[PDB]
Amino acid sequence: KFVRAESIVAKTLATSREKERIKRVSILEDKKAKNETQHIASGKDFILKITEGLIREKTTYDGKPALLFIVRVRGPLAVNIPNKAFKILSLLRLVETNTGVFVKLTKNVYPLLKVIAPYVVIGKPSLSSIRSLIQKRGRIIYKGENEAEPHEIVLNDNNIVEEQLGDHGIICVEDIIHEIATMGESFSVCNFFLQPFKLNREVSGFGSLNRLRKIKQREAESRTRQFSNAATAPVIEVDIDSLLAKLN
Amino acid sequence: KVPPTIAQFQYTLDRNTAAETFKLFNKYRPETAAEKKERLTKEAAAVAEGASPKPYAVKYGLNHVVALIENKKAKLVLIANDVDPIELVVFLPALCKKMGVPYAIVKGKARLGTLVNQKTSAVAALTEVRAEDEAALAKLVSTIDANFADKYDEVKKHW
Amino acid sequence: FITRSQAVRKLQVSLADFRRLCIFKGIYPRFYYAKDIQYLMHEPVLAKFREHKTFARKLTRALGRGEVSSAKRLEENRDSYTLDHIIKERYPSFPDAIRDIDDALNMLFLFSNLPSTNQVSSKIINDAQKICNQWLAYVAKERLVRKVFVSIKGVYYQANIKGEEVRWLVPFKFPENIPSDVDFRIMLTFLEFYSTLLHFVLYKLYTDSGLIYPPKLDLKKDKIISGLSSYILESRYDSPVASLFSAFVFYVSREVPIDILEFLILSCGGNVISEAAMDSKVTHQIVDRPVLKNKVAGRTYIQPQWIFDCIN
Amino acid sequence: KNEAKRVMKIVRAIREGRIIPPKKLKEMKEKEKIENYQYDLWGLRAPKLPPPTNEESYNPPEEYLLSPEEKEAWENTEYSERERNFIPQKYSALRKVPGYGESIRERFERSLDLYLA
Amino acid sequence: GAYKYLEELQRKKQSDVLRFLQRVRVWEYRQKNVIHRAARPTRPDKARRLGYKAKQGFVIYRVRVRRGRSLRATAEERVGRRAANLRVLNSYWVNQDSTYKYFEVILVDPQHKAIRRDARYNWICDPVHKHREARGLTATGKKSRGINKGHKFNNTKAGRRKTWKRQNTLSLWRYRK
Amino acid sequence: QQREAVRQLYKGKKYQPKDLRAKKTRALRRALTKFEASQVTEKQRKKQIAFPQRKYAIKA
RNA sequence: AUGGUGAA
RNA sequence: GUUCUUUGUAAAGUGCCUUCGAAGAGUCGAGUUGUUUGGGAAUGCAGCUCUAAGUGGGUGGUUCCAUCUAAAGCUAA
RNA sequence: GUUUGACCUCAAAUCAGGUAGGAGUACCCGCUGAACUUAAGCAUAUCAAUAAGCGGAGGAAAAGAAACCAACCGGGAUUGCCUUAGUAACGGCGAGUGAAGCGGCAAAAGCUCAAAUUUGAAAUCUGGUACCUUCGGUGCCCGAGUUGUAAUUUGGAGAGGG
């Protein structure tokens, strides 16, 4: 199908912001890690929280390992991601929009976290939001009858929990939630065990109300998510708990 | 057989130029009956207890537009082709050409109605503009004069 | 009698809204009772579906135009139809309501354990989980339990809400494979019917027998477990079932689901302490493990079947 | 002047109080519209109430386990020409209880009893 | 505004532009009924200068009449019988054929509350204006009655029957002249 | 008792039934009301205020 | 003559 | 007569000074066929053909001058 | 987008609100229109811009604020009466037909549109609905309406400002 000339320039000029955006960030945290401060913007780790009158509490980031749940968002408008962001989103396998994953935030994780900030939304979840996510959505890529494994289907059982993991004390689905809410050693194995979380999209349709509710909610993303595009851009945190009520 | 001043219409503005015209014109909506009323109640609640410049909008009455062209105050004038009495607007492209006000025949009368809080409009004009859209307006003037006027210089002829 | 093809032509509403209304009164073809449809045509809910349709034409001309400013106005100045005046025709006596609330919680406890889709709105779901924990708030408060039954399907319950043995199957807390066959248009309209029905009853059980409706919630207990220990409650025996676990402080552990099991002990009276709450005075710990580890003398180690044996 | 005259009239009306300002109308709608379904309302078909199960469960007496031939015979038979909606299984532990895969359908078929019957 | 341009455009009737509009409309009006309602007046400048406001209560009936008593008055009389609730205000020529002539007679609803209010048009609500066309009190009726001012209109100024009855009946006083 | 009950249920609302309205006559059920007849154009109201029909006497 | 009523 | 309220940088009027300042078309008119009159300068009207102008146009008076402004409408006694 | 959405037009309904018919008819307003009869037979003049018929109104109707009359040291909407007057004028100058301006009086009243932009804000109206002091007022919603509804102006000028 035919391409209008409006498109290919808008796609050009938006990605060639992002090709310029991550280049500067990739130069910066290089100079932050290699510690050659003669000319830098800022010398520490920034995490900002945006909640509600629309508070913007910017914080530092210590080395304390925390737990972040990250949802893939589809932004911005005309942005073919570059090679450097195809990778991180594929290594987190967040290549589908409206799909989530828990990861751990270290000082190894935070510099790569500034790469993918315009493409996802991040944040700290709560235990309810930890628990009510997993026991309501959960995929298990496991063997079918004999041949067809990749039926990812359902966290039906607690003995499939015995099957794959099992020997790490992994006995039930509630025990998995212990391994995620608390940083356990086998956290990455069970994180590799629950591969997506197919969240629903909020608007989910065309129609009378649906056109309007799309427009009314689309501007709400523009306030609750700002795209910093800075060298020392903060990482923006939203409340996951209010988001999962919109997504579960 | 059509006499040349009729079918000076139908040779209308094309796809992309018309889209860009509305990209400009939809910025300049008149404040609707509901919006105007709520603003004045805001003014009532504020000014009764405890400055603004002139706001630009499109001008849309046939008498108002025929005033503005020959005033001369109009910069761009959009003209619908489908009009129930065609004789209402047949003189209007000639008036614009005579006074040297840039005009464009747009396609669809209800298409003019959408940008203007009415059912139909037949004619719409943009007298003045905000400073940011000034260069964009003047560029569209040249775009319309190149596409509409220069291509159809022979529109005054040929039945 | 009249014909199914006749009544839609007769009522001149949507066929879905015929089916949507027909759930509301409770009209069933024996064929269509002709007086009853003539009885239906003078009813204020029929006012709204015509108005809800004529809202929709007036709105799509709005956004179709592109005046979103005017489009946004339509919603704020838009009513909702209530189903209060479908209830009092249908539930004359409140004790008749509690003999039909059997099916009501049997729907609504399902819906809390549902993923939000395009088909189902989460607001309904986040009400349903709220209404369930509103239901269990009163039940666990005044100890109103008689019998239990855990089975393959879900977990049945039994309680004398002023003596009628309600029975409501709580399903098991897992992802549920939503089948392609089912219809969440008919079922939701039941929930829509049942949800407002469940409001007044909980108002009735509070504001006439017990407490204020609804009590406030406690957010920070809801951050942990999001169940029955949250949603705190304020106002303003004869059975040994109600006398069970009287000052018997328990510990629950990570094997069982606490949510299905903290309910009963609080319905009896014992205190419930979980492993899951962080993320002594206790004298019981429920475990499902071939390898138990700690084994103190104070705690009494019973598999939870016996707790269900204590009830029946 | 026109708008200036029009304001002065709306000033006049709120001086006479015929009209409420829009900020208090939200306050008229804040007290209202939360107080919904929060009032007393009370102060013939028997609806065919469902059959009460007792002692057919996850941990039954295991003779209630279906014969292995009737397992497929229950499967090979189709729905509603059918005695059980399931086949019961045996679980010694509370933990081993599976995802009860067909509880959604059990209400959807029940729902059709509620109005079509 | 445009009404000066339309006023002058309607002068050149046999000119190329208006000639073409005639031959299209003459075909179109033959497709429709003898007496039917147009939603808007085709010559709106003429409608205004004969007293038409584009508000609720004003109606523009289009009417067809045969060629070779006056045709304008017959046109008004035909719509008077069909639209009896309305009151005929004025009529005007729009288009003609070899066989037929068309008029766009303008009407006012006296029953409609938008007319019973405003004082510029509430005079038509008064029962003295029932069927103005059936008494020759319209523009064309007053024209055919020969009612103007001058030496020309001496025998038919204030009723031609009235002046006849005055001149051909003897008048006698109490004390004879 | 029926008629007073109907008048009570149609208490001061626009367009109550034809069998309860005043008979009067036909012509008086047509013809402009007190308000409608006394309704004057905005210009004439200004000319009434600015130059009203004055009261005077003529001698001393 | 105008207008009407009847009629192998 | 007796009061209750009058508001908003509101609504006019008057004189001077300054800058502008659009008024009705298938109509007026023209020929003809009929009707109208006691109407001589077809008066008035209708039918049919063609159909204008803006320091304009209509009507009258011995070369000008006087007089009104059609083709829209309302109105008591 | 092989969807969908604007309008315009044509529909619809035992929906909501209305309205028109018919009777009366002396007067009034339109339309239509004879014959006996008069001058000599009858085409005009003459019965007659009648009677009958048709359509339409009201307490009156119609007419009416000049595209008027005049020829003067000008009058000044219309209607009626007195008079002009049986005059001018027409009429096989014959049956005869028959005004008008002026003057005296009765009664007196004038105004509204369309016309060039509210453009720093359709300032307007209908209807529904909720109340109120109900031949109506107000709030809210809906529709009409820019193919122009309000204010301002009608030649006596008028408008913009100072």
PDB file of C-alpha atoms (C1' of nucleotides) in Angstrom, chain I residues 20-162:
ATOM      1  C1'   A I  20     -58.033  25.272   8.057  1.00  0.00           C
ATOM      2  C1'   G I  21     -63.374  23.616   6.531  1.00  0.00           C
ATOM      3  C1'   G I  22     -69.344  24.706   8.115  1.00  0.00           C
ATOM      4  C1'   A I  23     -73.354  28.407   9.536  1.00  0.00           C
ATOM      5  C1'   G I  24     -74.596  33.539   9.167  1.00  0.00           C
ATOM      6  C1'   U I  25     -74.294  37.522   5.336  1.00  0.00           C
ATOM      7  C1'   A I  26     -77.331  44.106   6.010  1.00  0.00           C
ATOM      8  C1'   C I  27     -72.841  46.546   5.378  1.00  0.00           C
ATOM      9  C1'   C I  28     -67.399  45.676   3.058  1.00  0.00           C
ATOM     10  C1'   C I  29     -63.564  43.339  -0.034  1.00  0.00           C
ATOM     11  C1'   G I  30     -62.352  40.514  -4.432  1.00  0.00           C
ATOM     12  C1'   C I  31     -64.015  37.236  -9.003  1.00  0.00           C
ATOM     13  C1'   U I  32     -67.685  36.302 -12.598  1.00  0.00           C
ATOM     14  C1'   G I  33     -71.783  38.614 -15.455  1.00  0.00           C
ATOM     15  C1'   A I  34     -77.282  38.546 -18.403  1.00  0.00           C
ATOM     16  C1'   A I  35     -82.137  40.012 -20.373  1.00  0.00           C
ATOM     17  C1'   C I  36     -86.927  42.690 -20.500  1.00  0.00           C
ATOM     18  C1'   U I  37     -86.306  47.797 -21.101  1.00  0.00           C
ATOM     19  C1'   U I  38     -83.802  53.358 -24.123  1.00  0.00           C
ATOM     20  C1'   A I  39     -82.627  56.319 -29.250  1.00  0.00           C
ATOM     21  C1'   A I  40     -86.682  53.631 -35.203  1.00  0.00           C
ATOM     22  C1'   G I  41     -84.290  47.787 -36.610  1.00  0.00           C
ATOM     23  C1'   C I  42     -80.088  46.814 -32.598  1.00  0.00           C
ATOM     24  C1'   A I  43     -72.965  46.112 -33.036  1.00  0.00           C
ATOM     25  C1'   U I  44     -71.435  50.463 -29.342  1.00  0.00           C
ATOM     26  C1'   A I  45     -74.172  54.496 -26.432  1.00  0.00           C
ATOM     27  C1'   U I  46     -78.286  51.800 -22.943  1.00  0.00           C
ATOM     28  C1'   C I  47     -80.444  48.330 -18.860  1.00  0.00           C
ATOM     29  C1'   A I  48     -75.082  47.581 -16.171  1.00  0.00           C
ATOM     30  C1'   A I  49     -68.032  48.721 -13.977  1.00  0.00           C
ATOM     31  C1'   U I  50     -76.572  45.955 -12.214  1.00  0.00           C
ATOM     32  C1'   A I  51     -79.505  41.015 -10.439  1.00  0.00           C
ATOM     33  C1'   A I  52     -78.200  35.944  -9.903  1.00  0.00           C
ATOM     34  C1'   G I  53     -73.703  32.800  -9.118  1.00  0.00           C
ATOM     35  C1'   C I  54     -68.482  32.208  -6.864  1.00  0.00           C
ATOM     36  C1'   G I  55     -64.544  33.368  -3.118  1.00  0.00           C
ATOM     37  C1'   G I  56     -63.166  35.998   1.332  1.00  0.00           C
ATOM     38  C1'   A I  57     -63.197  39.067   5.818  1.00  0.00           C
ATOM     39  C1'   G I  58     -64.658  42.282  10.293  1.00  0.00           C
ATOM     40  C1'   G I  59     -67.162  45.199  14.202  1.00  0.00           C
ATOM     41  C1'   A I  60     -66.761  47.807  10.699  1.00  0.00           C
ATOM     42  C1'   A I  61     -64.211  46.514   6.172  1.00  0.00           C
ATOM     43  C1'   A I  62     -61.571  48.987   2.565  1.00  0.00           C
ATOM     44  C1'   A I  63     -58.378  52.970   2.127  1.00  0.00           C
ATOM     45  C1'   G I  64     -53.680  55.524   3.974  1.00  0.00           C
ATOM     46  C1'   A I  65     -48.431  58.466   5.380  1.00  0.00           C
ATOM     47  C1'   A I  66     -47.288  60.773  -1.693  1.00  0.00           C
ATOM     48  C1'   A I  67     -42.972  58.019  -7.544  1.00  0.00           C
ATOM     49  C1'   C I  68     -49.897  63.475  -4.749  1.00  0.00           C
ATOM     50  C1'   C I  69     -52.332  67.883  -6.299  1.00  0.00           C
ATOM     51  C1'   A I  70     -50.973  72.236  -8.417  1.00  0.00           C
ATOM     52  C1'   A I  71     -49.219  76.986 -11.394  1.00  0.00           C
ATOM     53  C1'   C I  72     -50.704  80.251  -6.681  1.00  0.00           C
ATOM     54  C1'   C I  73     -47.917  86.223  -1.431  1.00  0.00           C
ATOM     55  C1'   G I  74     -48.493  77.285  -2.885  1.00  0.00           C
ATOM     56  C1'   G I  75     -51.226  73.231  -0.604  1.00  0.00           C
ATOM     57  C1'   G I  76     -49.595  68.574   2.100  1.00  0.00           C
ATOM     58  C1'   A I  77     -51.831  60.549   4.708  1.00  0.00           C
ATOM     59  C1'   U I  78     -56.604  58.424   4.132  1.00  0.00           C
ATOM     60  C1'   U I  79     -61.942  58.358   4.768  1.00  0.00           C
ATOM     61  C1'   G I  80     -66.959  61.079   4.922  1.00  0.00           C
ATOM     62  C1'   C I  81     -70.258  65.267   4.540  1.00  0.00           C
ATOM     63  C1'   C I  82     -71.418  70.414   2.199  1.00  0.00           C
ATOM     64  C1'   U I  83     -69.905  72.825  -2.245  1.00  0.00           C
ATOM     65  C1'   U I  84     -67.400  73.017  -6.569  1.00  0.00           C
ATOM     66  C1'   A I  85     -71.920  71.097 -10.453  1.00  0.00           C
ATOM     67  C1'   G I  86     -75.410  69.208 -13.411  1.00  0.00           C
ATOM     68  C1'   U I  87     -69.509  72.819 -14.520  1.00  0.00           C
ATOM     69  C1'   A I  88     -65.153  70.685 -17.531  1.00  0.00           C
ATOM     70  C1'   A I  89     -65.508  66.855 -20.497  1.00  0.00           C
ATOM     71  C1'   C I  90     -67.616  62.875 -23.598  1.00  0.00           C
ATOM     72  C1'   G I  91     -72.158  61.124 -26.164  1.00  0.00           C
ATOM     73  C1'   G I  92     -75.105  59.145 -35.187  1.00  0.00           C
ATOM     74  C1'   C I  93     -74.100  66.502 -29.266  1.00  0.00           C
ATOM     75  C1'   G I  94     -79.257  62.910 -29.345  1.00  0.00           C
ATOM     76  C1'   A I  95     -81.965  58.635 -24.593  1.00  0.00           C
ATOM     77  C1'   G I  96     -78.038  61.799 -22.141  1.00  0.00           C
ATOM     78  C1'   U I  97     -73.647  60.273 -19.345  1.00  0.00           C
ATOM     79  C1'   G I  98     -70.905  62.690 -15.489  1.00  0.00           C
ATOM     80  C1'   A I  99     -66.021  63.823 -12.558  1.00  0.00           C
ATOM     81  C1'   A I 100     -61.749  66.313 -10.156  1.00  0.00           C
ATOM     82  C1'   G I 101     -58.143  70.062  -7.708  1.00  0.00           C
ATOM     83  C1'   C I 102     -59.271  74.315  -4.697  1.00  0.00           C
ATOM     84  C1'   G I 103     -62.805  76.160  -0.370  1.00  0.00           C
ATOM     85  C1'   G I 104     -66.010  75.131   4.458  1.00  0.00           C
ATOM     86  C1'   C I 105     -66.358  71.090   7.968  1.00  0.00           C
ATOM     87  C1'   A I 106     -66.241  66.008  10.581  1.00  0.00           C
ATOM     88  C1'   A I 107     -62.073  63.310  12.485  1.00  0.00           C
ATOM     89  C1'   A I 108     -57.051  63.672  12.971  1.00  0.00           C
ATOM     90  C1'   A I 109     -51.344  59.769  14.469  1.00  0.00           C
ATOM     91  C1'   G I 110     -48.047  58.181  12.510  1.00  0.00           C
ATOM     92  C1'   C I 111     -44.460  54.695  11.506  1.00  0.00           C
ATOM     93  C1'   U I 112     -41.946  49.438  10.367  1.00  0.00           C
ATOM     94  C1'   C I 113     -38.672  46.680   6.533  1.00  0.00           C
ATOM     95  C1'   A I 114     -35.138  45.847   2.621  1.00  0.00           C
ATOM     96  C1'   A I 115     -30.882  48.603   2.188  1.00  0.00           C
ATOM     97  C1'   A I 116     -22.991  49.281   3.682  1.00  0.00           C
ATOM     98  C1'   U I 117     -20.159  44.008   9.349  1.00  0.00           C
ATOM     99  C1'   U I 118     -22.187  42.436  16.435  1.00  0.00           C
ATOM    100  C1'   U I 119     -17.368  40.491  14.053  1.00  0.00           C
ATOM    101  C1'   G I 120     -13.365  42.295  20.785  1.00  0.00           C
ATOM    102  C1'   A I 121     -17.053  36.949  21.019  1.00  0.00           C
ATOM    103  C1'   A I 122     -25.786  35.153  17.442  1.00  0.00           C
ATOM    104  C1'   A I 123     -25.801  40.018  21.296  1.00  0.00           C
ATOM    105  C1'   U I 124     -31.875  36.334  18.771  1.00  0.00           C
ATOM    106  C1'   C I 125     -35.736  32.852  18.891  1.00  0.00           C
ATOM    107  C1'   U I 126     -38.530  27.851  19.185  1.00  0.00           C
ATOM    108  C1'   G I 127     -39.435  23.590  22.086  1.00  0.00           C
ATOM    109  C1'   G I 128     -38.758  20.157  26.097  1.00  0.00           C
ATOM    110  C1'   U I 129     -38.020  19.981  31.175  1.00  0.00           C
ATOM    111  C1'   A I 130     -37.427  21.651  36.515  1.00  0.00           C
ATOM    112  C1'   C I 131     -39.534  25.418  39.687  1.00  0.00           C
ATOM    113  C1'   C I 132     -41.919  30.175  40.423  1.00  0.00           C
ATOM    114  C1'   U I 133     -45.714  35.419  42.160  1.00  0.00           C
ATOM    115  C1'   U I 134     -48.719  31.413  35.551  1.00  0.00           C
ATOM    116  C1'   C I 135     -52.598  35.660  29.304  1.00  0.00           C
ATOM    117  C1'   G I 136     -46.144  34.832  32.033  1.00  0.00           C
ATOM    118  C1'   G I 137     -40.754  34.772  34.590  1.00  0.00           C
ATOM    119  C1'   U I 138     -36.248  32.001  35.570  1.00  0.00           C
ATOM    120  C1'   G I 139     -32.440  27.860  35.503  1.00  0.00           C
ATOM    121  C1'   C I 140     -31.002  23.769  32.591  1.00  0.00           C
ATOM    122  C1'   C I 141     -31.133  20.844  28.250  1.00  0.00           C
ATOM    123  C1'   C I 142     -32.626  20.762  22.757  1.00  0.00           C
ATOM    124  C1'   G I 143     -33.357  22.567  18.211  1.00  0.00           C
ATOM    125  C1'   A I 144     -33.557  26.844  14.544  1.00  0.00           C
ATOM    126  C1'   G I 145     -30.322  30.025  12.774  1.00  0.00           C
ATOM    127  C1'   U I 146     -24.503  32.555   9.616  1.00  0.00           C
ATOM    128  C1'   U I 147     -28.043  30.693   2.416  1.00  0.00           C
ATOM    129  C1'   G I 148     -28.274  35.991   8.834  1.00  0.00           C
ATOM    130  C1'   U I 149     -31.452  35.745  13.797  1.00  0.00           C
ATOM    131  C1'   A I 150     -30.837  40.420  17.536  1.00  0.00           C
ATOM    132  C1'   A I 151     -29.155  45.911  18.542  1.00  0.00           C
ATOM    133  C1'   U I 152     -28.241  50.308  15.806  1.00  0.00           C
ATOM    134  C1'   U I 153     -30.805  53.355  10.503  1.00  0.00           C
ATOM    135  C1'   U I 154     -35.694  54.452   6.735  1.00  0.00           C
ATOM    136  C1'   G I 155     -34.258  60.509   3.415  1.00  0.00           C
ATOM    137  C1'   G I 156     -37.811  64.357   8.214  1.00  0.00           C
ATOM    138  C1'   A I 157     -32.063  61.672   6.556  1.00  0.00           C
ATOM    139  C1'   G I 158     -28.557  58.789   9.066  1.00  0.00           C
ATOM    140  C1'   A I 159     -23.943  56.742  11.045  1.00  0.00           C
ATOM    141  C1'   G I 160     -18.586  57.119  12.885  1.00  0.00           C
ATOM    142  C1'   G I 161     -15.893  59.774  16.535  1.00  0.00           C
ATOM    143  C1'   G I 162     -14.539  64.461  19.275  1.00  0.00           C
TER     144        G I 162
END
